[PDB]
Amino acid sequence: ALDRSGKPCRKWTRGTFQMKSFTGVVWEIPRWTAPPRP
Amino acid sequence: EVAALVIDNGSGMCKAGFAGDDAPRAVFPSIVGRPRHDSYVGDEAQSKRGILTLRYPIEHGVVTNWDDMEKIWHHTFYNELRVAPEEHPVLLTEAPINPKSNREKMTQIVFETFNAPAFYVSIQAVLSLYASGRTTGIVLDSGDGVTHVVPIYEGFSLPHAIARLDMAGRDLTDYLMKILAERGYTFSTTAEREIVRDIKEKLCYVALDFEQEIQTAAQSSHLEKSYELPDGQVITIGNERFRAPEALFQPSVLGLESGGIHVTTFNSIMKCDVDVRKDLYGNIVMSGGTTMYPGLSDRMQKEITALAPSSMKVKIIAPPERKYSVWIGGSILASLSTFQQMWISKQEYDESGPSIVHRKCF
Amino acid sequence: SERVLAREGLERTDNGMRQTSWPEVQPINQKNYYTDYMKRDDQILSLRLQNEANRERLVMDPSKIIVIHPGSQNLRIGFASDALPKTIPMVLGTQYSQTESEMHEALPRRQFEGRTMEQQYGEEWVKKYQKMCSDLKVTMRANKLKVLPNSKDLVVNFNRRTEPEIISQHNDPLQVEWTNVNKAPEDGTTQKVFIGQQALRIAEDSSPKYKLWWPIQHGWLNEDDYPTRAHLFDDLEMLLDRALRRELGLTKKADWKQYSCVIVIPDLYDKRYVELLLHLCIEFFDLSRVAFIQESMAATFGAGYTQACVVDVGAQKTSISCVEDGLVIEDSRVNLKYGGYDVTETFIKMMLYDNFPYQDINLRRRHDFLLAEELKMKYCTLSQANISVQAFDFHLRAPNQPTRKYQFKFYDEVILAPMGFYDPSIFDNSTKLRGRRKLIDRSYNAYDVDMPDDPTSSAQLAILAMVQPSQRSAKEIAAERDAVLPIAPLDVAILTSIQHAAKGDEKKVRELVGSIMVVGGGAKIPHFAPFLEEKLKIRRPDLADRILVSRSAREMDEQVVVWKGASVFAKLSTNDSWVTNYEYKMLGSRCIYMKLLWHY
Amino acid sequence: FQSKGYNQIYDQIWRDLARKDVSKVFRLATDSYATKASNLKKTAILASKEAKRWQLRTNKGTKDLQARAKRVMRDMMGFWKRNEREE
Amino acid sequence: ADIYGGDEVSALVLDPGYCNTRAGFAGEEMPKQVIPSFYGHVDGRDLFGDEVIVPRAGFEVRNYMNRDSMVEDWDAATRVWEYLLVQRLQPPRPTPASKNGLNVKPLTENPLLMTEAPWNTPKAREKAIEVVMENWGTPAFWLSRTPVLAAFAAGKATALVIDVGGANTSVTAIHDGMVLKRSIQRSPAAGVWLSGQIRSMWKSQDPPVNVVPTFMVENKKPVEAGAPPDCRLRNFGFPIHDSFRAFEEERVLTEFKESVVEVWRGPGKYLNPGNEDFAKTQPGRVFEFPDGSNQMWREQRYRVAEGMWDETAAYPSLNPDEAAITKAQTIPALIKAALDGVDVDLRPNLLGNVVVTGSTSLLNGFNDRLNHELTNMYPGLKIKLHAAGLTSERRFGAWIGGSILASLGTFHQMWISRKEYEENGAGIVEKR
Ligand SMILES: Nc1ncnc2c1ncn2[C@@H]1O[C@H](COP(=O)(O)OP(=O)(O)OP(O)(O)=S)[C@@H](O)[C@H]1O
Ligand SMILES: Nc1ncnc2c1ncn2[C@@H]1O[C@H](COP(=O)(O)OP(=O)(O)OP(O)(O)=S)[C@@H](O)[C@H]1O
Ligand SMILES: Nc1ncnc2c1ncn2[C@@H]1O[C@H](COP(=O)(O)OP(=O)(O)OP(O)(O)=S)[C@@H](O)[C@H]1O
Ligand SMILES: [Mg+2]
Ligand SMILES: [Mg+2]
Ligand SMILES: [Mg+2]
């Protein structure tokens, strides 16, 4: 089906994600993030 | 059940309306105004231009200010179509080879700002091909802001073979003002640009042999058509009638270093697979407002025949509805029962975020 | 091992990623599908706007409707409120390097300085003129009319032994007025161009030099005479612009947006000509609406007939169509490339052969054209009882040269030129097809760009098959038919058109044959309807009890029955066939398919 | 970097990447492309039929057009029965 | 966590070559942007794309790649890669309100995967990361070899990669996703050499065949086979540059290669005693030059391709400097010399997984000849050939391998970070 009765979607925002090389160096990639849904 | 909205935004004119209709309900300039020292859209912004700074949010077919773009969509739903988006699926269109970041950004705005229950993005040229009644071809799409050539085989475009002549409707208006200034009329004001656009869309045509029309234009009482300004005074334009559209075939006259539309079309066919090329020459399709000049198809048939091999069967398709082929292809798509199982649902947006559009819209 | 790698800080890692980002597309189910596209009239712009208009009406001024009937000699134009059209020659004069007379061989065609008259006129034509003479003699002898054996000899000897009289400028009963090409126009426009009667009366030797352009000939766009499609379209636009300014007095162009237009088209139209006319009206003139009606439909609407076989004889075309229940019967349409202009040229050629005094006559020269039309309207006749050696005179008036009077005699040239409609090989058909698709191609489907979309009829193919007995594609078949000029005797064309209309139903043949209606100026020859009824009766002796041919309807001029019918079609409330300005700006020629009252 | 430990890790990552991941993701990608191309082809066949269908003549279309034409013609007979009686 | 979407890493994949340069995002079946490596120069301005090469008074055509398939000019390389990766593949900036006529660092989100030739020397690799990290604000970088990517494009861990490009033909053995450095073998007998064979073969014909490019022809009429052309040329106020003329003639030569030329696939070499005599009796293939000139090609169709299989068969170079190819530079010689550089245990594995690549490998009969030559030179082994690519489109091979690689989750531990570079400066030598 389509919508319930409107009601908003959860907001997405450009955050940052820490990720790691096999030689242990840590770097940041920009990534979409949302607050945790109950 | 309710119809989807089909929205076809453009550097010049927004088109909007309900899927299943054969024509838009609404067409208005893609213009927004803010106070110089509240905001306005389309012809209300044109009317009040004295107290506004006026801007186009779409440039060369790509969205370049998302603040102004959001005002245009707000106007389209609530003032033009008189519908709440929360009830209706939305089919949007995008320019060939536009950036991946922009597909995400429009996907966010329909779900977070309009609460569209379901949504799709579609490549303009491919919509125009469906409208033209075929599955394979090459689309010359030429509007206000950009001219693209787009090869398509069995419903799938070939993006490496897409070529982009960075010159179209607005460049020809500015050129027509320059050569009418060389005939002694005065044109350098936004009111005067809207006058010269109205001259171009009535009096201009494409010569079948440009050097022979230059040769014969020296004396013809038939050629020198005339036009009455809003002021009531009268102007008379002659060789300027066919000199303006010649800039599509010779962009040198307009002072830019590029192949014209016939050469760029040949080049796009010659970047495709050898077994595909017969089917591309047999199906050259013309789309967008700048393809409406009288005699254009006849010059394309002659110009592409000079480049192509003598064994090829070149055919130009230019139907009557071709200034709205992109909208019409949208309407047809979004009215198929198959579209219900092709759109991004707002549940998929809740779980996957803006990047869902790359997984689901090709 | 592992803890030494961890001590060096080296460790392989998922980074919490999935195996791959590579997109996994699900297959679309395409079974049991349906569509919602153009399924309801509210979704079709043309029909939505009509429903909105019908509501706005229920919840139009004839003086605001222009009625246009273009042609190869004459344009007829007026408001639907007018009792009668304004008629002008459909011709345009512009400044040029050369006159129409300088660019081409003289008419009628003669091989000047040939060995003998048999070559000069052409041996086939001379044999056919002699055949027609002998057949007329046998016919009127069988009817027991007088035939003096020396009748042609008296004519030839008198014409050969006669010379003109020069008349003093004031003793001439009619001082000619030539068009002053130097004079500034006063119709809200600046270009010194002339239309209609003013253009024909431009002197051949005016100080700035003028050429006359006829944008329509043989009943289709005159591509032969034009160098480009742009020039031809610029002239049909210029002619109709000046006709609205000069015949209808619509001097202020800004006000034209409030007028609508009814255009009369041929029953075998060219879709490119229909689409040119709709584009002139809505893009160049900006009229509010346009509607189209076919010549045969408009003819019956002039009369007030439900069911009729319409014969329309013109300057350059003759058309036959049956009409019934509001529709032209699509298979019945025949369209022949001769008319009353052929009768003018054939009369002049027959008289020139019979030593007619003014041997230097050339129908490409404007005063000679007007003289030949005037001679033909006075003397040519299909009443056989009128015939004897007759003696008359005409004044040759020519620019900057004194009036000359010629006495001349004639005997049968006056009947044999008309009788060409029953042996049309006597007409000069040699150049009619020259230029036929030189600038404007055949109509092809908007989508299926290989398939011809121009109309066809069983009857017109049956006529082409008489001229030339006729795997090939649709373009090859079309191009093969386009090479054949449709020429048939008028009695054979009528009976074949009706036979196709009735599709072998003898009872519809009997109805249509009792309902033949003649219109157009070429039919305006004396005794034409009686002559045509006699010719049909000897070709179908079974139908002689019921063949009935009538000239015009409700006491109108043959030349205006069609315009009167078009003006009724403008007025009547049930007509929803209008293409509105806005529909056309959205969808162009596509809205014709939606709104016309026949399958376009 | 210049040690048997580093060399072993680097080689062991590439061995698993080449043997396990590249072989799986190539099969997924080749099947995915075949689904995408199939989806698009059949959709373009439906959308192109719809674009042309307004042109196809039908029982209903022809009878409604015969009815339009017959009403207009009866209104023209009405027109004369008034004017030819009132004149 | 449960805070993250389907978004992971959007990597840019870059593949520069002597003929073509190709750019795009990973996770996509073909490159979005494909442009000639030949670029226009006019008035200090540099002009990129097949669409911007057009006759003008100053116009000169240059290349930023050498015929070693390596960057010759790092300035020009930076301008070409700026055009593809920044102007074409990212969002634009808006025009000012004063200029629209109504009123009277760039790669921070996308790590870059760059493709190199397998003989690319370490100084060049050092300059690639130096140029990439300084210009564009790229988060992280990777630099990989064309043969590895072509094997992953065929879905293979271990393969023998035959790669027939423009400037070079290469043979190389890949095992467990890595290049066996002893197996690398290279040759000029590739697409650019095949164009010189065709030019030579055309000037050797009894009436010479003269190539004249499409830009020089206004209008042409069809004519019978062997007849002089009914055609009218343009003229220009300015003299045309020899480089421009050459670049435009290479479009005609590429159309001759894709449609006339055929590799002799038949039993034995083309110059075996019966074979050329038989070839003259076959039906030919027709071809039209842009001038309208038209002819049927019979045996010369075979003889231009044969030289990369048999050094005896080749036409002389029209350039008198460009030395004739030797036996050691033919394709069968490179294959034998490549597998002789590998452990005898791997040979049946490698020859069961032959991967063919490079646009010159698309000639009619190429795979049929290769299969026959392998079968006759390694008898009693199963030989099988694989195309690089997901699709019947085989012009992109390395690029699709980069696309698959940079989309694997296990790969994201490999990228050299911005920080990793800033601490070390020449991390490449040890990280690949
Ligand atoms: N009948 C016509 N003849 C010639 N030019 C026309 C005509 N109608 C519109 N145009 C021009 O076409 C342009 C608008 O074309 P569209 O295709 O609607 O523009 P658009 O969709 O905004 O453009 P893009 O390509 O999508 S940015 C303007 O430059 C108009 O002046
Ligand atoms: N009184 C008359 N006697 C004989 N012929 C006449 C008479 N009045 C007009 N005509 C002829 O009628 C012809 C003109 O007929 P029209 O119907 O006006 O032609 P038209 O409509 O321009 O031709 P079409 O129908 O467009 S081909 C000319 O050839 C005249 O010579
Ligand atoms: N279909 C075709 N058949 C044969 N040759 C072709 C075809 N298409 C292109 N070519 C030739 O292919 C060559 C270029 O091959 P590519 O694979 O693009 O070379 P590239 O990758 O730029 O070259 P390198 O070797 O990597 S520097 C040119 O010499 C073209 O003329
Ligand atoms: Mg557009
Ligand atoms: Mg008429
Ligand atoms: Mg390569």
Structural description of this entry:
Chain A has strands spanning 13-20, 26-33. With 38 residues, chain A is mainly β. Chain A has a two-stranded antiparallel sheet. The radius of gyration of chain A is 16 Å and the shape is rod-shaped. With 362 residues, chain B is of the alpha+beta class. Chain B has a domain at 169-254: ATPase, substrate binding domain, subdomain 4 (Actin, Chain A, domain 4). Chain B has 14 helices and 19 strands. In chain B, a hairpin with a 4-residue loop joins strand 11 and strand 12. In chain B, helix 4 crosses helix 12 and helix 9 (261-269) packs across helix 11 (296-307). Chain C has 600 residues and is of the alpha+beta class. Chain C is 36% helix and 15% strand. Chain C is built from 21 helices and 20 strands. Chain C has a six-stranded mixed beta sheet with strand order 3-2-1-10-11-20, with helices on both faces. In chain C, strands 12, 13, 14, 15, 18 and 19 form a six-stranded mixed beta sheet that branches. In chain C, helix 10 packs across helix 19 (561-571) and helix 16 packs across helix 18. The longest helix of chain C has 20 residues, at 123-142. Chain D folds into two domains: 1-56; 57-87. Chain D starts with a helix and ends with a helix. At the B-E interface, strand 6, helix 3, strand 14, helix 9 and helix 14 of B face strand 13 of E. Chain A: This is INO80 complex subunit 4. Chain E: Pfam families: Actin.
Write the layout of secondary structure elements.
The complex is a heteropentamer of chains A (38), B (362), C (600), D (87) and E (432).
Chain A (H helix, E strand, L loop, with lengths): L12 E8 L5 E8 L5
Chain B lengths: L4 E4 L4 E6 L7 E4 L2 E4 L4 E2 H6 L4 E4 L2 E2 L2 E2 L2 H16 L8 E5 L5 H13 L5 E6 H8 L5 E6 L4 E7 L2 E2 L5 E3 L3 H14 L7 H14 L6 H7 L8 E4 L5 E4 L2 H7 L14 H9 L7 H5 L2 E4 L8 H12 L8 E2 L7 H9 L10 E2 H7 L3 H5 L2
Parallel strand pairs in B: 1-9, 9-10, 11-17, 17-18
Antiparallel strand pairs in B: 1-2, 2-3, 4-5, 4-6, 7-8, 10-19, 11-12, 12-13, 12-14, 15-16
Helix pairs in contact in B: 4-12, 5-6, 5-8, 9-11
Chain E lengths: L11 E5 L3 E6 L7 E4 L1 E4 L4 E2 L12 E4 L10 H15 L23 E5 L5 H15 L3 E6 H8 L5 E6 L4 E7 L2 E2 L5 E3 L3 H14 L12 E5 L8 E4 L8 H16 L17 H5 L5 E4 L5 E4 L2 H7 L24 H9 L7 H6 L1 E4 L8 H12 L7 E3 L10 H8 L10 E2 H5 L5 H4 L1
Helix pairs in contact in E: 3-11, 4-5
Summarize the structure.
Chain A: This is INO80 complex subunit 4. The complex is a heteropentamer of chains A (38), B (362), C (600), D (87) and E (432). With 38 residues, chain A is mostly beta strands.
